[PDB]
Design a protein around this ligand. Sequence first.
Ligand code: Q0G
Ligand code: Q0G
Length: 143
Amino acid sequence: DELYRQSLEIISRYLREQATGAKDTGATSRKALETLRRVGDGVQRNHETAFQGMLRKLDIKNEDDVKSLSRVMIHVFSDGVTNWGRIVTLISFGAFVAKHLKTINQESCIEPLAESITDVLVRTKRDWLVKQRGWDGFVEFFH
Ligand SMILES: O=C(O)c1cc(SCCc2ccccc2)ccc1NS(=O)(=O)N1CCN(c2ccccc2)CC1
Ligand SMILES: O=C(O)c1cc(SCCc2ccccc2)ccc1NS(=O)(=O)N1CCN(c2ccccc2)CC1
């Protein structure tokens, strides 16, 4: 799936940049990162309170914590209205969790976190993402 692999590249790179501050390792994939850096950073500033609250409540300190959350996150994310704000909040929350993982570690484990965020996104929103012209539709929505 091109939608799954494209989503994994964009979500993994943003979470890696956010956790470190660089970061260290098809124009739409590139233009989606620049939009996500701009809108994603804004969501992390405007909703830090709710992000700190969810993070404290979920705890999330290891890969086993990352795995069990995804199984709950798939179910609750498939419920209710879908829009780009909701999708960027999911990714923004992923970046917020990743910054916390680097804070209590040395780096990892943010790669299984990015896979779990992508799996939540593509498994629950694939039809809507298709109807919205995928990651290209994302760039236009926040031009
Ligand atoms: O999004 C934020 O970060 C958020 C922050 C505050 S804190 C008071 C802010 C305020 C503003 C102006 C003047 C006085 C107080 C209050 C609401 C905020 N969001 S939500 O958009 O209204 N929202 C989303 C987060 N919600 C949540 C639900 C369950 C578990 C944890 C969080 C609560 C509902
Ligand atoms: O998009 C929604 O459907 C959405 C709904 C709520 S209501 C859950 C409040 C809560 C309470 C305790 C601990 C964590 C979260 C809050 C945030 C929402 N989105 S998100 O910010 O994009 N996000 C992150 C939190 N997610 C989560 C839900 C249940 C267990 C574990 C994680 C849902 C996806």
